[PDB]
Amino acid sequence: CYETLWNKVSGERLTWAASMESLEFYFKRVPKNKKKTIVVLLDELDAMVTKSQDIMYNFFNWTTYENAKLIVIAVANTMDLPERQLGNKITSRIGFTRIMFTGYTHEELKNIIDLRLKGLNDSFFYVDTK
């Protein structure tokens, strides 16, 4: 996931270590005058951390730098993934907005289904028996 980001922000192809150092140097030393903001959607962060505990730290630390203009939108299943994985001190020294999603109620799911069939419910169709 490192090199992909680099390959999507730099057009070059680098290995994972070189991508790590390149992204860190681009998020740390390049002045804000000559950079364009990046929005990263770290979908399924659960699979990224595993034994490494490296991806998540790098991505939640690259947003701490003032030079870096990065809006990391991480998404996961377990609400307590950061505080467990990084530790209370690190998850406190990094201020990130936490959002929790609750499963839809019956009314909400009925509304979703009804909205997805607004154009077909109680409709007239011409059908040929042939």
Binding site: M20, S52, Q53, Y57
Partner: protein, 295 residues
């Protein structure tokens, strides 16, 4: 060509060191002829003594020839094969000693295992090095077979002076009489870290705490590589705490810990550097709460 052994009650560490460093080396240097003969002294009472590092020192000092690809054999141990090649090479060199390998407490915790004993057995056949050793255990001669006794070619000598062995008891606890975690080696780490440096203690505390966090994320287990801390992660954490500014200072001050086996640095399968402490989680917590936590 007689490797020499000292056995008896009391600590022979001071006596044997006095013999080898002050008397043996200058005298053999004078007789060979200038510089004194190097003296590799090997502390066997330390449970952190490793045979890989000992042979690394011996090959850094003596500098033997490398072994050819054919001589490597199919996955065979490189240390023993290199030693046998050294024996073959040294069977023709002039018979003048180029190193004395002092072995304190030859029957200690991490020095009595068969691998390092086999290494020393093959190493002592080399006439150009002198193997002076000391033993303490009563059943110490149980460690040597017929072949190992032949290769050692010992000449036992009795030294008994009832010395109190202050240095030997340092590496293990005495309040619990040493009955528990005798070969852990954490007590020596506590002793060496008690008064080392404030910044080194602080960064060691950071590393220990990160390792405990990783263990919790992952029963008392050893601190293996899978749970250790990444070098880049550690540098970032230290920079966030104004401990080590850059790579150079951190590596320079960490080499001291690496050489004393309080920590180890390896490379993961993906190539990421990892630094870890090989102590048990309970031992790590005790070390944190007894010396680290007092600041």
């Amino acid at each position: 060509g007689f490797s020499l052994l000292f056995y008896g009650v009391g600590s022979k560490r001071n006596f044997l060191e006095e013999f080898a460093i002050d008397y043996l080396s200058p005298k053999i240097a004078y007789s060979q002829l200038v510089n004194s003969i190097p003296c590799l002294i090997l502390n066997g009472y330390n449970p952190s003594c490793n045979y890989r590092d000992v042979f690394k020192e011996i090959t850094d000092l003596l500098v033997p020839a490398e072994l050819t690809r054919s001589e490597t054999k199919y996955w065979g141990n490189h240390v023993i094969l290199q030693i046998q090649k050294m024996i073959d090479f040294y069977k023709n060199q002039p018979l003048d000693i180029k190193l004395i390998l002092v072995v304190h407490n030859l029957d200690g915790p991490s020095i009595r295992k068969n691998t390092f004993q086999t290494m020393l057995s093959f190493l002592s056949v080399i006439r150009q090095i002198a193997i002076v050793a000391s033993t303490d255990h009563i059943y110490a001669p149980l460690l040597w077979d017929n072949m190992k006794a032949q290769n050692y070619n010992f000449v036992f000598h009795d030294i008994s002076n009832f010395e109190p062995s202050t240095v030997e008891s340092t590496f293990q606890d005495v309040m619990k009489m040493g009955k528990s975690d005798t070969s852990s080696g954490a007590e020596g780490a506590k002793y060496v870290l008690q008064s080392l440096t404030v910044n080194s203690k602080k960064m060691y505390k950071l590393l220990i705490e990160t390792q405990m966090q990783n263990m919790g994320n992952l029963g008392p287990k050893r601190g293996t590589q899978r749970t250790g801390v990444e070098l880049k992660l550690f540098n970032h954490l230290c920079a966030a705490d104004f401990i080590a500014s850059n790579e150079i200072a951190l590596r320079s001050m960490l080499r001291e810990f690496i050489e004393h086996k309080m920590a180890n640095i390896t490379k993961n399968n993906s190539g990421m550097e990892i630094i870890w402490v090989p102590y048990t989680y309970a031992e790590l917590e005790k070390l944190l709460k007894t010396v680290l936590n007092t600041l």
